[PDB]
Design a protein around this ligand. Sequence first.
Ligand SMILES: Nc1cncn1[C@@H]1O[C@H](COP(=O)(O)O)[C@@H](O)[C@H]1O
Ligand SMILES: Nc1cncn1[C@@H]1O[C@H](COP(=O)(O)O)[C@@H](O)[C@H]1O
Ligand SMILES: Nc1cncn1[C@@H]1O[C@H](COP(=O)(O)O)[C@@H](O)[C@H]1O
Ligand SMILES: Nc1cncn1[C@@H]1O[C@H](COP(=O)(O)O)[C@@H](O)[C@H]1O
Ligand SMILES: Nc1cncn1[C@@H]1O[C@H](COP(=O)(O)O)[C@@H](O)[C@H]1O
Ligand SMILES: Nc1cncn1[C@@H]1O[C@H](COP(=O)(O)O)[C@@H](O)[C@H]1O
Ligand SMILES: Nc1cncn1[C@@H]1O[C@H](COP(=O)(O)O)[C@@H](O)[C@H]1O
Ligand SMILES: Nc1cncn1[C@@H]1O[C@H](COP(=O)(O)O)[C@@H](O)[C@H]1O
Lengths: 155, 155, 156, 156, 156, 156, 156, 156
Amino acid sequence: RPLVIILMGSSSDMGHAEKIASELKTFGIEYAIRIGSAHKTAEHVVSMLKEYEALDRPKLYITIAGRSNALSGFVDGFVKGATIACPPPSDSFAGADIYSSLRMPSGISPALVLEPKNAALLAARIFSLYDKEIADSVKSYMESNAQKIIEDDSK
Amino acid sequence: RPLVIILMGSSSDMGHAEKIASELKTFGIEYAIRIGSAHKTAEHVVSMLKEYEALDRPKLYITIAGRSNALSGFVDGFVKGATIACPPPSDSFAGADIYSSLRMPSGISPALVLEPKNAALLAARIFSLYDKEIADSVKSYMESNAQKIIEDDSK
Amino acid sequence: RPLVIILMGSSSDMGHAEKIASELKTFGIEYAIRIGSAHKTAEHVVSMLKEYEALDRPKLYITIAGRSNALSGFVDGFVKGATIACPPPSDSFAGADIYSSLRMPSGISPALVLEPKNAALLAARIFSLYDKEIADSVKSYMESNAQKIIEDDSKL
Amino acid sequence: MRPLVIILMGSSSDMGHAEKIASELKTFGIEYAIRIGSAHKTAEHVVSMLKEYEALDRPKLYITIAGRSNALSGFVDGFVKGATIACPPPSDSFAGADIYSSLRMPSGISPALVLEPKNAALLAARIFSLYDKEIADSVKSYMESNAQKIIEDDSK
Amino acid sequence: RPLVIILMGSSSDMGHAEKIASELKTFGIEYAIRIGSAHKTAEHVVSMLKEYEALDRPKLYITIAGRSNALSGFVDGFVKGATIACPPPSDSFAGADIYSSLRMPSGISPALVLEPKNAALLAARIFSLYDKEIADSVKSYMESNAQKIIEDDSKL
Amino acid sequence: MRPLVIILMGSSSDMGHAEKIASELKTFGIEYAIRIGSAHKTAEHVVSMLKEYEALDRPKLYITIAGRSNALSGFVDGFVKGATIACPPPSDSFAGADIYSSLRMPSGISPALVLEPKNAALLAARIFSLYDKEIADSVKSYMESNAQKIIEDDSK
Amino acid sequence: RPLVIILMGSSSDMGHAEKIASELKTFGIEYAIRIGSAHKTAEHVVSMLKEYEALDRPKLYITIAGRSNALSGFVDGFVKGATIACPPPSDSFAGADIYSSLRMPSGISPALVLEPKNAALLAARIFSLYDKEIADSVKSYMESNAQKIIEDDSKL
Amino acid sequence: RPLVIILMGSSSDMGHAEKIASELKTFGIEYAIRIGSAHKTAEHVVSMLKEYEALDRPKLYITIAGRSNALSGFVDGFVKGATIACPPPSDSFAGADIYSSLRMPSGISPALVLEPKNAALLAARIFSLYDKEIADSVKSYMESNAQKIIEDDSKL
Ligand SMILES: Nc1cncn1[C@@H]1O[C@H](COP(=O)(O)O)[C@@H](O)[C@H]1O
Ligand SMILES: Nc1cncn1[C@@H]1O[C@H](COP(=O)(O)O)[C@@H](O)[C@H]1O
Ligand SMILES: Nc1cncn1[C@@H]1O[C@H](COP(=O)(O)O)[C@@H](O)[C@H]1O
Ligand SMILES: Nc1cncn1[C@@H]1O[C@H](COP(=O)(O)O)[C@@H](O)[C@H]1O
Ligand SMILES: Nc1cncn1[C@@H]1O[C@H](COP(=O)(O)O)[C@@H](O)[C@H]1O
Ligand SMILES: Nc1cncn1[C@@H]1O[C@H](COP(=O)(O)O)[C@@H](O)[C@H]1O
Ligand SMILES: Nc1cncn1[C@@H]1O[C@H](COP(=O)(O)O)[C@@H](O)[C@H]1O
Ligand SMILES: Nc1cncn1[C@@H]1O[C@H](COP(=O)(O)O)[C@@H](O)[C@H]1O
């Protein structure tokens, strides 16, 4: 039932998108990967979002755009359910592209998460408030992350 | 049915917490406001989170801590459902406290949102994937934000 | 004659827009002031741009958005002719909102200018390559600025 | 009255950045010239060169290239009548803070700042396109193609 | 005798921890190296600290956490005696992870030291106020560093 | 053999910051002295003062206070045998970047950096507390009370 | 017969220039105060600098320009002897205007000093290498600064 | 008989110091190279500076210390005539070590220059106010830099 739409601004973001998709798969969550720019292909992004919004199933969008991230806010303002911003990494200007993801106007509320695997985790825990299968799979994952540390310690 | 636990590190964060609480109220979402520090009162935060986790109702935590935000990551790692980090504003070191909210390890995934009203919005849209009442109230709110702009334009 | 569309993301940008509009008026350049957000009212911005794009007169767009400026690149990718990004000033995060105006993808080329009077000056000077009336007006304005400096020096 | 872009750089060391801009102007069919002159070390040489270019009866732009503390963009911009574009070479020294020397102009100095060399060439083309129809056709072709690659990437 | 507990948030911090541990060994100071995250294994850290806190010997904790350092303030608020924060080096966001170690609330007082050899030196020097054996060892180490500089100068 | 804290500041202008640190040490029952000396302007005066304090047979710490480029913390730290604490006065010049002059020590120089004056006093108390039981009781009282205010705020 | 030429970019810099001139006057050093912009009035600056350069006497230029400082490099590359950059203070972009004064090309060597009174002191101390009178006046002023600190101390 | 004393904080600075010395040698200026740290060897620096100060001849000190630069202010506050700070380059914290060289107290006026060859040029140009031979050598070198740029241009 759940769907995550992973929407990136450029094919050059694919490496980052696929890290998120891989991790969604570990949690049993269906995803779609799509490409569309809020600067260059604005009407194509709008028509694509109308198709997804029309589907009667619980959904999240994870929005990926490097440089000045117009995409996350654009998507977030169009759709009605929650969204997650997960920009690809950059060291340009000491990582200052990050501000274009953080500094939203009033009424625009994408969830910002830096790491791709953490973005996928957040999606899974959003669904888990009402989805017992996903909830069970997040529980197993997080406990295993905690076990690794305790096991590393005892060694 | 939904519950948002608003957990701040210090009573001096209350002004910021109350902005979030006010806005949750506009969406018909029950909240609890609580105080506890991840540096100073770690066992008290743990016992408080066990009580909330024990409740069989869909829940989110919104975690508020100024300066170096240990709280959001601490809470996020303990609980199983999603959390939101919403630190109070600061201009110390050009706002560099923000990094302590962004830079999470692997497996820790709080949603970072700067504005208090946007944090509340995000909570509401998380619930709205499965809650028709809240979904209807987010729809009305966001459409009214969009109408304001179009109305400002026509003037 | 030339037209400048001053498009801002919020009514709260109006004081900044008015400074740009006032300066354009001193060069005798017609303007229009409009409001629309790239986040909250994308289709309204799309619809509005299609209207301005259909006018047969030389035009520039001056795009104003505080915080994370999605508006300038959005408009820039939509319209045919040049645009100018002139964000309102902010000292939050030591002014780091500016990077959201600077960091464009390939094929998006808004001119970034900080001061609202300088954004109006650049717009004038874009038209001046072909518009002699605006060129003379720019010339008098720039010569005037230069003369004030020289007079300030000689008065010491 | 054919368009001209003068690409003026502060040092021979900037040549590779200048060539990326020249190359892209060539795809738009816009004539350019590449010149060298320092606002710090060869001020009178720059003034003499600008006076020569300024005398030409043709629509012109200057794209100004200087690394480190960019004195050149403001210097040229304050001297010439028509619009200019600042396109500094990339640097990660001090986390890119050389950029502030291109951004922070006094009143009356209005160079258009664009980071990417291809985007500086595109802004140049789109400035002429307000009046030059052939350049406008070439810009629509270029920007349409950028957009089609994206749609095409998605559908693939 | 003195004990230093070197507590790091992840196995990936081990190379940094080992540099601190090696340096302590040159001052003849006993250490223990442990792993626990303030985010992922809070109760394990609580349980571990209660064990070390029950030892009747002078102790310091040296706390190592990359990224947003929750670990140092968490341990510092829990234990009675002093602690030292020594985060692993990072150049992400121009090193801005450092602020997560600096910006403590009221009543949380870890000593921040950047270099792992300097964190070990501070720990030694904390003990040295009361431990003559560590004091002589510190004295020889510091005099030695000073002599190398003077010898480098005289050799020129 | 009673604890002593020497609070050494670079200028009389730092006095208000020094007093906040002295006040808090007083609540812990720790004797202090407040002195003035510049590592830039009065180097020999500082060396002479440090030699006097260093000769005392009692557990001692130096808390060093210098605004702007902090030469003083490293200067004192390299001179004395036992631990030191850097606690610079607050500044928002250059977005607080004076802090890097307290953080970036060479090898062999290990002052403890703490931002808040009350926290620098607490770190001092907790350094002595490893060996001094009365100070440890006073620290538990203090930190327990901080924690109780919080629990008490929540339950109210 | 030393001369220090204080050249600023705008009359709005006059308050900063007056602090420098005042301090120069305390050392018995003659100054001239002048206004000219490297962006808006380049030829005016060149002709001004020609007049001073033609004076057969030991001279320094102190160059003041806010925002992107094109002036100090421009002056420095033109004149023969040493120059000093002392820009006015700014909090814009976390004080990032400073980079425009720091980041010079090869062959351009203005001395950067932040504080106006310290810019005047460096000027004195430059001349003092060969001017015995200024060496006496610098010596008494610096000694007087040291003595103030020692007296402030002795009162505690 | 000018003397430039190049004083560095650590032998690890030697590569940077050698670039300065090399360039001084091209202007016919005698230099000495010395090592001493303001943190670890303060008395050694003081006694060294006493020896050079006692020389009846025109001198400058060029002070090199990486990380938190305590050295330039320390040297500058001690000696009578002008000094120059030229720290080694660093990318640590986005180059924020630079602030430790910029942010001086009242009465401390080291000239800050980034590039080693420019530090040597400022040294020359300081002496050139009264030394006719160095003025000739500076003049030919600066003219030669200008001519290179004009020749690079003329080839395009
Ligand atoms: N900010 C933005 C707007 N449209 C695309 N981008 C982003 O800018 C970078 C460069 O895009 P392109 O490959 O189209 O030049 C990519 O990360 C892409 O997500
Ligand atoms: N970082 C942190 C850890 N424990 C509390 N804080 C935060 O630090 C600031 C100062 O807290 P206090 O009032 O306890 O000094 C408050 O915003 C609080 O959320
Ligand atoms: N970045 C952005 C996207 N949509 C509007 N903004 C800008 O965000 C600020 C706050 O907008 P509002 O008043 O809509 O909250 C305004 O400067 C506005 O231009
Ligand atoms: N800022 C400046 C002033 N004069 C030239 N530049 C720039 O400084 C860098 C180094 O110049 P040079 O090669 O002359 O040392 C080059 O990018 C050049 O454009
Ligand atoms: N900040 C934090 C909280 N818990 C662990 N970390 C740190 O985050 C980094 C990545 O941790 P992991 O290897 O657990 O992903 C490590 O430096 C670790 O100390
Ligand atoms: N960095 C430094 C060197 N000597 C003194 N300071 C500090 O610089 C500031 C100004 O010093 P003054 O009052 O002497 O001008 C004060 O905080 C002082 O501690
Ligand atoms: N950078 C520059 C070039 N020409 C003048 N300035 C500086 O820009 C600021 C504003 O100048 P104006 O008053 O001309 O707008 C002033 O500090 C002035 O020295
Ligand atoms: N700041 C300072 C004080 N004493 C030496 N340094 C500098 O710190 C760096 C490392 O010094 P060391 O080699 O002594 O660790 C070198 O650039 C040196 O000049």
